[PDB]
């Protein structure tokens, strides 16, 4: 079936530039109009730009016109989004999307998305503090002061699945913070070991903190 795969999302300082791209597969690309749609948690979905099949006509909304340049390669089946004069309000997840029409229309297919963050903050690996207690016990793990998202938190490399709660991040001092809890039988601890592994790809960092009785 149809397949769209974005790539390119990264951290960028305000007023910066970046180029997003889409790998179109499973359908005759040269026949449909393509487009970008972004999504912010505070303002939902938002059409960012569109381009026609032969790429001769392009349409952007006003809050983007000038800064954004959409384009394509029908020979290579790739869609592109050039961005400049980047702003904090441009921070969102961008979706590669297909129109069912030769020009524009609704959206039948959507890629998996790529995230764009616009900030002055510098990449920082997170600090990981084990959270232990002073029928079944509940342990924690605090991932504090990192940037930017995401951080992948697993327990025992994934061995523990049931009763795991990872709560969304929160910007507090201009750095994210998140925590995760896990519930295990009172017998399986501190007999069996328990560890939260926190991987932060942005800084190629990955820590493994073992929880132990204080």
């Amino acid at each position: 079936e149809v397949q769209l795969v974005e790539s390119g999302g990264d951290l960028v300082k305000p007023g910066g530039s970046l180029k997003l791209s889409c790998a179109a597969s499973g359908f005759t690309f040269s026949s449909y109009g393509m487009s970008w749609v972004r999504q912010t948690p505070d303002k939902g979905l938002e059409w960012v730009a569109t381009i026609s099949s032969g790429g001769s006509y392009t349409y952007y909304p006003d809050n983007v016109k000038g800064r954004f340049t959409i384009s394509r390669d029908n020979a290579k089946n790739t869609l592109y989004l050039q961005m400049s004069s980047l702003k904090s309000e441009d921070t969102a997840m961008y979706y590669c999307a297909r129109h069912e029409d030769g020009n524009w229309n609704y959206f039948d297919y959507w890629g998996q998305g790529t995230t764009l963050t616009v900030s002055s903050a510098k990449t920082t690996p997170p600090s990981v503090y084990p959270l232990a207690p002073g029928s079944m016990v509940t342990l924690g793990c605090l991932v504090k002061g990192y940037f930017p998202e995401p951080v992948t938190v697993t327990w025992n490399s994934g061995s523990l699945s049931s009763g795991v709660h990872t709560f969304p991040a929160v910007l507090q001092s201009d750095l994210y913070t998140l925590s995760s809890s896990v519930t295990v039988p009172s017998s399986t601890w501190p007999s069996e070991t328990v560890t939260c592994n926190v991987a932060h790809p942005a800084s190629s960092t990955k820590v493994d903190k073992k929880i132990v009785p204080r």
Partner: protein
């Protein structure tokens, strides 16, 4: 520009109940209205195209109606695999525009929280900081209240709250509460306590430790 207006914003219905979503355009757009479904972490999925054309592979308990400016999306028997966010989209005039969405929560039995409080770790202290955490898991509804009071007092500055989406298993919510405050202001104040207010209990559900 055509202004699509969605409603209701949210809507906590319970299994089988009828789900009605409406969208109004500030201008006549004919039958150029489309609807989308989007579950947590995932792109939007197509469900109804132009002319109220139900999508192939889409269940038959999903229907669309309208022409002009007033449009209505309908889920008949809401199955617990419908709990997502939905969005309408006008499409007869650039710039394309979506509704602000309608989120759906599963209306389900009440559930009291499992509170858990953790004192700050030595490692963090060593770094010159202190963070007391308090987990509150598997409850319902989300509408809960967490109060913190340092040494029998009442502090509420320098606290973070995170809420997990409604569990896809027991449809319950969970939230964590972090209290950050330099090691100094920490170890020399005595009773750190976490207090909650959920409609499952009549009195304040507490949880605390002493340094």
């Amino acid at each position: 520009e055509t202004t699509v207006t969605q409603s209701p914003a949210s809507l906590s219905v319970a299994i089988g109940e009828k789900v009605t979503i409406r969208c109004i355009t500030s201008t006549d757009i004919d039958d150029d209205m489309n609807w989308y479904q989007q579950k947590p972490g995932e792109p939007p999925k197509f469900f109804i195209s132009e002319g109220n054309t139900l999508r192939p592979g889409v269940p038959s308990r999903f229907s669309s109606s309208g022409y002009g400016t007033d449009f209505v999306f309908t889920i008949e028997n809401m199955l617990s695999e419908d709990v997502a966010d939905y969005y309408c989209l006008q499409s007869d005039t650039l710039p394309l525009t979506f509704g602000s969405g309608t989120k759906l929560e599963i209306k389900r039995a009440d559930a009291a929280p499992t509170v858990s409080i953790f004192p700050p770790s030595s490692e963090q202290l060593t770094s010159g900081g202190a963070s007391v955490v308090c987990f509150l898991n598997n409850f319902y509804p989300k509408d809960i209240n967490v109060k913190w009071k340092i040494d029998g007092s009442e502090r509420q500055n320098g606290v973070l709250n995170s809420w997990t989406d409604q569990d896809s298993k027991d449809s319950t919510y969970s939230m964590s509460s972090t209290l950050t405050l330099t090691k100094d202001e920490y170890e020399r104040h005595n009773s750190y306590t976490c207090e909650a207010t959920h409609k499952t209990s009549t009195s304040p559900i507490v949880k605390s430790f002493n340094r």
